[PDB]
């Protein structure tokens, strides 16, 4: 690093902080399956407000854990099933960037059942914003979260990314012990809070396919 | 022999017939239809476009070959123009040949065969036809505007979407014709001909049923915002709000407000002083540009606002300066003298627009199709000056208040978002 590296020093050119828009892009293309993703500004990297979302994430359900499973521990999934007839997939979307973030849900479903799957995913998110969270839900998600994380670092890349990601953002290194605390410190409230920050905040939406039966942001 | 009169029979089934012998050495017939891209569904998107280019394919009575050879044999022509909700087939030739060209015009609009091969062979033309049209940014943004301004029908593109080039079936073409080219949605207009003749043909050769077949799912307003970053130095932009429908007297206000704000120079390389908008933007930017009053009036809705073209960097100023220029008019910034000038420009424009054979034939049949009637240039003139100073500033407000839509393209670097105007 020393006796070999080089190049300039200092943050060189900095990035013009991300301004939130709350747009709506629709891509009509015929493709039978309709992909859609509705989000709101979420939490940025580091911010404790994220931990909540990470938990709210796993609470709502972040992609099956059992091969060809059903995902009962998944509020969202379960919610949408009880709404549509045909095959589909819906999950809790969540990204945490430096000066901002995005949170919401991403769905894939037949074109015709696009309306129901998408809306059923909204109510499913409001019901959680309206106390629809059990202290038991919050404890399970805290495990899934602890599990996921812990597993993600088994592969050489996983571990190297985990290390360096931090070592780059704050030249430090939280021990898997501390990270574990920050998780369970999330309260039942925090969760329903995030849940609300979603239903309230301005949303953005992206879709693609035969958007024939797909709703516009101002219909959710 | 001087000037006759504009007749207009209205046959049973609903097929309208309006003619007008102007003794011009050349006639120009045309089947105006209530067809268009708005009647399309996600399912047959673009079929309307491909139908437009099918005009030269074989018909139950004339082969692809004979259609083109036949018309050319007499120095005739065949064209098809179409808006989001209006299709106009129409031939044109020296008087002495109207019969000849008629068969083809007829066969084309009522006897299509849409042979599978002839069709699939044609669809690649969509590829091409689109590429040329799209050479003018003018068109690209307008497609997107409509996409943002609406949620349906009028939100459909005028040019077949790419993914569907080549997936439009013969069935889709037929069903489209059967469900829209109905005697009650059609009008057989003509010029340089006698009503007795034009009528004869209409009843002795037309067969299709009447009734709007499939009706269009009324245009819902969205108020979208589509931005197309593409590098191209010049930034095209268009900001609008819902406007006035057809007929609507309210529409007459906008036409006046239009000419008041300025609707494109009248003097070669002019300055357009009589143009509030133009003038306003100039006093705002340094480099070359162009800004005008945009205005469309569709059946169950309309769009109104301004379209600008400017350097990328001065996009922010040109666009905003165009907003304030529109608010200042919404806040009594209209003189009774401004309103009177616009009323002339309007009377002028209109009056001139009908000098060309096509202009007149479009003016006639457009009405003869919407309300089987015919306002005299006298009455139309009234409806104009009946616009008051208020009406204008009213429209002006309806804009600043209503929800807007916006379409842009180019190096949008210094271009503002709808929620910044």
């Amino acid at each position: 690093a020393e006796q070999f590296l080089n190049i300039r020093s200092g943050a060189g050119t900095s990035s013009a902080k991300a301004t939130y828009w709350g747009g709506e892009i629709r891509e009509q293309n015929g493709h039978s399956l309709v992909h859609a993703a509705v989000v709101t500004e979420g939490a940025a990297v580091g911010s404790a407000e994220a931990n909540a979302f990470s938990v709210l994430q796993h609470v709502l359900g972040a992609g099956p854990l059992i091969k060809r499973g059903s995902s009962v521990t998944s509020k969202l999934y379960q919610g949408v099933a009880k709404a549509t007839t045909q095959p589909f997939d819906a999950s809790a979307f969540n990204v945490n960037y430096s000066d901002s973030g995005l949170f919401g849900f991403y769905t894939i479903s037949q074109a015709a059942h696009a309306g129901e799957v998408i809306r059923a995913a909204m109510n499913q998110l409001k019901a959680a914003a309206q106390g629809g969270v059990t202290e038991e839900d919050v404890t399970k998600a805290k495990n899934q979260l602890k599990a996921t994380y812990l597993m993600s670092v088994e592969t050489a890349q996983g571990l190297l990314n985990e290390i360096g990601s931090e070592a780059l953002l704050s030249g430090t290194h939280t021990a898997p012990s501390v990270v574990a605390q920050k998780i369970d410190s999330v309260t039942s409230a925090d969760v329903v809070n995030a849940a609300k920050k979603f239903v309230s905040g301005k949303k953005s939406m992206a879709a693609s396919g035969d958007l024939g039966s797909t709703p516009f942001l101002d219909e959710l | 022999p001087g000037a006759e009169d504009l007749e207009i029979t209205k046959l049973p089934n609903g097929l309208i017939i309006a003619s007008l012998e102007n003794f011009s050495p050349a006639s120009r017939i045309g089947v105006f239809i209530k067809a268009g891209s708005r009647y399309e569904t996600t399912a047959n998107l673009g079929t309307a476009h491909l139908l437009r280019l099918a005009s030269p394919l074989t018909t139950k009575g004339a082969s692809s070959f004979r259609i083109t050879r036949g018309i050319e044999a007499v120095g005739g022509s065949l064209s098809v123009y179409s808006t989001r909700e209006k299709m106009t087939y129409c031939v044109e030739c020296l008087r002495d040949h109207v019969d000849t060209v008629m068969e083809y015009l007829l066969n084309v609009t009522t006897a299509p065969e849409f042979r599978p091969w002839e069709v699939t062979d044609l669809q690649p033309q969509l590829k091409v036809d689109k590429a040329v049209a799209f050479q003018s940014p003018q068109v690209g943004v307008l497609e997107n505007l409509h996409a943002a301004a609406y949620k349906t029908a009028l939100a459909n593109p005028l040019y077949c979407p790419d993914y569907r080039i080549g997936k439009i079936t013969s069935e889709q073409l037929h069903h489209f014709v059967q469900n829209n080219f109905t005697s009650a949605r059609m009008a057989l207009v003509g010029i340089g001909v006698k009503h007795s003749d034009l009528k004869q043909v209409a009843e002795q050769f037309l067969n299709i049923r009447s009734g709007a077949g499939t009706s269009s799912a009324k245009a819902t307003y969205w108020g979208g915002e589509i931005r197309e970053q593409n590098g191209h130095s010049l930034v095209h932009a268009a900001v609008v709000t819902e406007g006035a429908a057809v007929g609507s007297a309210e529409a007459n206000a906008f036409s006046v407000l239009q000419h008041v704000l300025g609707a494109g120079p009248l003097i070669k390389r002019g300055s357009s002083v009589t143009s509030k908008l133009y003038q306003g933007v100039a006093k705002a930017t340094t480099q070359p540009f162009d800004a005008s009053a945009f205005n469309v009036n569709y059946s169950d809705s309309g769009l109104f606002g301004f379209y600008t073209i400017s350097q990328a960097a001065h996009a922010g100023e040109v666009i905003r300066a165009a907003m304030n220029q529109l608010k200042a008019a919404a806040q009594g910034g209209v003189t009774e003298e401004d309103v009177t000038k616009a009323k002339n420009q309007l009377k002028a424009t209109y009056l001139m627009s009908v000098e060309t054979a096509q202009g007149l034939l479009n003016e006639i049949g457009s009405e003869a199709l919407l309300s089987g009637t015919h306002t005299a240039p006298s009455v139309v003139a009234q409806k104009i000056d009946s616009v008051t100073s208020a009406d204008v500033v009213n429209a002006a407000k309806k804009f600043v208040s209503g929800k807007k839509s916006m379409a842009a393209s180019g190096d949008l670097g210094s271009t503002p978002f709808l929620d910044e105007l």
Partner: protein, 443 residues
């Protein structure tokens, strides 16, 4: 009410000349709206090497205001009456005309007169337009079709005045003086060479009274009443190949010296160009199009488009064709094109001329589709043909034409002639003047 008749019904075009030389002409229609303008017999051909580009620089100022009514004063007065003012400047014909309510017929003439006579030529504006023209050149330079025809003239009429562009040189634009624009106007915009034409709902008499009023030029010496005769431009079988393998398509234009307005053959030439016609990738016709070249073009993907042309001039002219193609089909296209030309001289069929004549008449009629176009025909006819030529006459002349005539006339102007060529773009495939010169005979 057969075509024939509708022709002999169109009102006659009236013409009356003033003591200054100005010629006023018009065709009266019931039209509530109209068009009136002054068609001057001046252009870049009248310019010499030192002022090439004057008539164009001047074109840019005939609208920025006169002595009496400055910029806003002019525009305001004109914009406010719902009138459209605009014009143009060719190689040997310049024009300025307005589109106004037949009502304003007389105020417009006043305005027209005030432009051709009292152009302000505000030395402040001049420096601005200087930068504008310079800018329009940058643009027009990206119009292959233009570049190609200019070049066509540049070599076909090399060494003469007709080989200059209308817009002029980058140097002349950068240096022309108020004085230059001044004299240009004084020397050329002169009564005996101008023509006040009008079309629409207008009284010829009312028109001419208005003419008398503001178009009150005075003439003392004979010199003033005289119309100069330009020096003859020498045509030259030659070629100019401007190659740039970076442009998408390639443009090619080939032509032979044409006779000139006055010559009756022109009719026949047009009937011929009517056979070969023109084409373009969006012509619905397709493989069935009547023009063999077009048909061939379609069957072999020979060109994005092609077009014949018979550009007339006072004493000379250019009879040729132009096509845009892909680098790799330039030869096949050129081959086929000359093919049809040779066919025109050797085997034109009666059926062809029949179609050609009809198509021609139709175009002839479209040339009078509105007050403006009609007006443009008057201004030009008087200016070029001396008098007005009625469709009834044209139609007559056209009917006289037959296969034999087409062949004789075409042979006359085409067969074994040294053509003028201009090629632009990725033109490596098309090649050798000689190979092309031999295409002029037998196919």
């Amino acid at each position: 009410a057969t075509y024939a008749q509708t022709l002999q019904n169109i009102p006659e075009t009236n013409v009356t000349t003033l003591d200054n030389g100005l010629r006023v002409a018009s065709e009266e229609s019931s039209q509530p709206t109209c068009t009136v303008g002054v068609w001057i017999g001046a252009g870049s051909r009248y310019e010499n090497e030192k002022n090439n580009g004057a008539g164009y620089f001047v074109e840019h100022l005939a609208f920025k205001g006169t002595k009496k009514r400055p910029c806003a004063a002019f525009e305001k007065e004109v914009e406010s009456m719902g009138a459209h003012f605009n014009g143009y400047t060719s190689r040997e014909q310049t024009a300025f005309y307005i589109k106004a309510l037949s009502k304003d017929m007389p105020k417009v003439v006043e305005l027209l007169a005030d432009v051709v006579q009292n152009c302000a030529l505000e030395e402040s504006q001049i420096e601005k337009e200087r930068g504008v023209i310079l800018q329009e050149l940058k643009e027009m330079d990206n119009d292959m079709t233009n570049v190609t025809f200019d070049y066509l003239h540049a070599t076909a009429f090399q060494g003469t005045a007709l080989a200059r562009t209308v817009e002029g040189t980058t140097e002349n634009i950068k240096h022309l003086t108020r004085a230059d624009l001044a004299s240009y106007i004084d020397t050329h915009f002169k009564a005996p060479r101008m023509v006040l034409a009008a079309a629409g709902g207008i009284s010829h008499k009312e028109l001419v009274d208005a003419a008398r009023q503001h178009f009150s030029g005075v003439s003392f010496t004979y010199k003033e009443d005289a119309v100069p005769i330009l020096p003859r431009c020498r045509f030259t079988g030659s070629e100019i190949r401007a190659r740039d393998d970076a442009l998408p398509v390639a443009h090619v234009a080939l032509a032979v010296e044409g006779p000139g307005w006055a010559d009756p053959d022109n009719v026949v030439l047009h009937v011929a160009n009517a056979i070969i016609g023109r084409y373009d990738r969006t012509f619905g016709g397709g493989k069935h199009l009547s023009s063999r070249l077009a048909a061939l073009a379609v069957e072999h993907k020979l060109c994005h488009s092609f077009q014949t042309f018979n550009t007339s001039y006072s004493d000379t002219g250019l009879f040729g064709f132009h096509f845009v193609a892909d680098p790799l089909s330039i030869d096949d296209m050129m081959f086929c094109a000359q093919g049809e030309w040779m066919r025109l001289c050797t085997s034109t069929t009666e059926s062809e001329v029949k179609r050609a004549k009809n198509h021609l008449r139709s175009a002839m009629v479209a040339q009078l589709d509105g007050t403006t176009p009609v007006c443009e025909t008057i201004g030009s006819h008087l200016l070029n043909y001396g008098r007005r030529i009625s469709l009834e006459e044209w139609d007559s002349r056209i009917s006289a034409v037959d296969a034999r005539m087409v062949r004789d006339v075409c042979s006359k102007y085409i067969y074994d002639k040294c053509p003028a060529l201009a090629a632009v773009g990725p033109i490596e495939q098309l090649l050798d003047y000689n190979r092309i010169r031999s295409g002029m005979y037998w196919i």
